[PDB]
Symmetry: C3
Subunit: 314 residues, 3 copies
């Protein structure tokens, strides 16, 4: 595929600051080189320089709103830029709050996009239902059209315009959903496959249904927002909000291999990788290596193997 890499070293959507190193550790693992080692056309747009917003007091319970709102507004512009360039945007992120800007900018160019959100969490708390105040657990609430009128005017997000309907998104991997978030899921009728469904159906049927659900009516661009805590912490331990009983390494690769095979991937987010949280140097490399593997699968790397359109035996 044709990829446009965007580094987004941002962490103000949650407490821990090490998430800002995501772009760096991922690049160091040879992500660019590896993508090119495939049938991939890669153009790196660099790391977006996020300026400090020294004066950013909480809005009610919500923390660092102006900093988060500015980082997403900026990211939205860059993403829309790479999309206008006929490239699949690859956002190497910090925290998941950046999804607000990534999906927003993606939808400007492709308003008909469908979203696949792999995460242990729904991240759909409103500024009024959140208990932590961390914006990385509220991105979806700002993007849903049906929730407009329920989201207060939070400083830093006046530029936001809900771009996706509750019907254009599917969750995969849920295992720690807040009560208000659960109420929102059932009320707006959002499609999801919690770990319970994955256990019941198998990742195979889950992906069959997910894609059918989003592309049955018509093929449309796909945005995959992958939070690394969606995978079990035995695979991605260096992350801020780990939850046991997650998707396996294999299921992670299955999801992405299937997404790739649709040929419809147009936007990708690799989020919440925080090297600073590894209990050992190995947990860091384990988290980074898994994050990279997931990324490569999104762009063609298949476990059964790959080969060029040439005669290898000759």
């Amino acid at each position: 595929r044709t990829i446009g890499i965007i580094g987004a070293p941002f962490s103000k959507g949650q407490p821990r600051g090490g998430v800002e190193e995501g772009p760096t550790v991922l690049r160091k693992a040879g992500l660019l080189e590896k993508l090119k080692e495939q049938e991939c056309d890669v153009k790196d747009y660099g790391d977006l320089p996020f300026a400090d917003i020294p004066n950013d007091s909480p809005f009610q319970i919500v923390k660092n709103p102006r900093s988060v709102g500015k980082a997403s507004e900026q990211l939205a512009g860059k993403v829309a830029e790479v999309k206008k360039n006929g490239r699949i945007s690859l956002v190497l992120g910090g925290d998941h709050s950046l999804a607000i800007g990534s999906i927003s900018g993606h939808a400007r160019v492709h308003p008909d996009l469908g979203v696949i959100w792999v995460d242990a969490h729904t991240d759909i708390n409103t500024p009024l239902t959140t208990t932590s105040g961390n914006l990385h657990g509220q991105p979806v609430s700002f993007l849903l059209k049906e929730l407009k009128g329920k989201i207060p005017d939070v400083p830093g997000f006046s530029w936001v315009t809900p771009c996706i309907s509750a019907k254009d998104i599917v969750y995969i991997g849920l295992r720690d959903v807040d009560p208000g978030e659960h109420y929102i899921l059932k009320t707006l009728g959002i499609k999801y496959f919690s770990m319970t469904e994955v256990d019941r159906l198998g990742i195979g049927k889950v992906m069959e249904e997910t894609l059918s659900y989003l592309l049955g009516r018509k093929k449309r661009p796909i945005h995959l927002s992958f939070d690394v805590d969606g995978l079990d912490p035995s695979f991605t331990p260096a992350t801020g909000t780990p939850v046991v009983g997650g998707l396996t390494y294999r299921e992670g690769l299955y999801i992405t291999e299937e997404i790739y095979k649709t040929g419809l991937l147009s936007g990708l987010d690799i989020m919440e990788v925080n090297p600073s949280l590894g209990k050992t140097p190995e947990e860091v490399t384990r988290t980074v290596n898994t994050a990279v593997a997931i990324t490569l699968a999104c762009f063609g790397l298949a476990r059964e193997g790959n080969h060029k359109p040439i005669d290898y035996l000759n």
Copy 2:
């Protein structure tokens, strides 16, 4: 649900004594508080005080028969008490021999009960087929109606009256069954899903069949006897008889989430958790935390989330 907690610090059904700490470590993990944090009405009946039976020599090969028989006779009375109180009995146990009293007392009030036994073992050795002499590996033999006449009059169990037919029980998780036990399984035609069946069908179909098998003819109270060694030792390491290749954390939660959803759970046993056997302080907390998670799922905690019957967005 409406729960009646019963602590049963007993270990004479096997060699290791640390199993007697089960009720304590589980309570310390905040089990009561956590259940109440749900739509749960909790009444704790305390820890049953098991008196010492100093004079308890083996009956043939069977060890501590009078001590085990007395502990089960006592537990049976308490369980029947909580059942008469319209509450689901939750037996925080020591070793699995206590299942004799738990199921017995449960059946006094609800003679039509069906049993789901999650375990790596069948625990159906008779006093004559057992090679270890440990009674925690023989509870089922004392409960089956079809085995009466094959169980000798063992000191301490004259109060026992087989309350369940081979047709009212289903095993899930088997991977270390003795030859005589296997002979009993095939001969009495007991329904089971060994790890081989779980691998073949998937935990989803396994639960579909298990519940259909026990409730197809008519809905009836369900007794879930959960031996923590049914789960893989990577999840519940602090237990006396671990066996590799066990049920996963996810499968453990799936089984219980499905049981809960039947609305028919009326008796639950959480057994064999032995803190003293953890190779590290973390293996102990890992075993206890998993045991607690399984318990909460039996009473409504769902991985997709939970919410009260109120308007969260208002």
Copy 3:
């Protein structure tokens, strides 16, 4: 079953030399005693004495060709010997290059054999497509009838005569296939179930299809070549070419339990176990114990249990 054990302490098919200890550590774990503990008739043909071929310079890129070719030629003769004795050959090996001789000797007596290759790799590189030069990653290329004319005359293999068609083999567990190997797979139309297929279908359906694929037309002898790196390194860490996201312990036992149940197993290879590569004494015992478990399942050991044709209750 009736087993003929053959120890093959050979490692020249790859760089690391510790693989030569496979037969020793497996025997020390009590493999013979354990098989006999079952309804197994065991005859050990000892460890084949592989003489040193001091003068063995590379053939182009291929390493230790004469040593590897001689070790396989020798093994082929022994395997054919045990087969003529009405016994299932059990090759406790070193590296996977020995599969050349094992399958060759097996096919002399049973030309209609079908092959099941459990491995993370296809091991089908030709002397011309290999990049490593290690012959343990090329055994299949020497055995396929359809590849004859594409394999150069490599010193030490003039005795080789392709004995299996691309249609008589099934791969299970693939996750690291080279480009040329992938080209060969799709070109010769070889049937395989990479980790992607296992994830999609489940090991249950995978085995249903595998056996149906090989025995649908007619029942025929089965040769199972099991490379321990086919299993995840969390189960078999002491091996030379580990690859994450492998088959689970359970899936490993499922495959073999199903193979056993066909009653058609006639040739088995347990390869690539290298004690010298364990990062700890426990990783070695973990690798060896798993390798043994897989072996026992091939010969009847079932997770649901086993019993003799006698009355256990009497």
